[PDB]
Amino acid sequence: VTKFNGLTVLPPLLTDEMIAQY
Amino acid sequence: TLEILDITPCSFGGVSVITPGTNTSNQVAVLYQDVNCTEV
Numbered sequence: 172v173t174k175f176n177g178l179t180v181l182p183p184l185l186t187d188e189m190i191a192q193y
Numbered sequence: 194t195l196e197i198l199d200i201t202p203c204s205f206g207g208v209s210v211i212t213p214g215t216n217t218s219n220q221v222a223v224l225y226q227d228v229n230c231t232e233v
């Protein structure tokens with residue numbers, strides 16, 4: 172699997188490593 | 194001078210106030226999203 176005019180991508184609360192930990 | 198300069202926009206981020214229960218406490222924690230405090 173493979174935006175700066177006020178568009179903000181909030182990071183997920185669960186990080187990819189932490190989702191991997193789940 | 195024939196040099197290349199990358200332009201990235203001025204840092205912006207929603208300010209989020211981390212507030213413990215008002216009855217419980219009065220202290221405040223402020224969050225600056227996707228910005229390092231070196232810029233702040």
Ligand SMILES: *[C@@H]1O[C@H](CO)[C@@H](O)[C@H](O)[C@H]1NC(C)=O
Nearest residue numbers: 226227228229230231232233
């Ligand atoms: C914020 O700190 C320095 C700014 O001098 C920068 O190099 C670093 O990558 C930044 N940290 C981030 C974006 O997490």
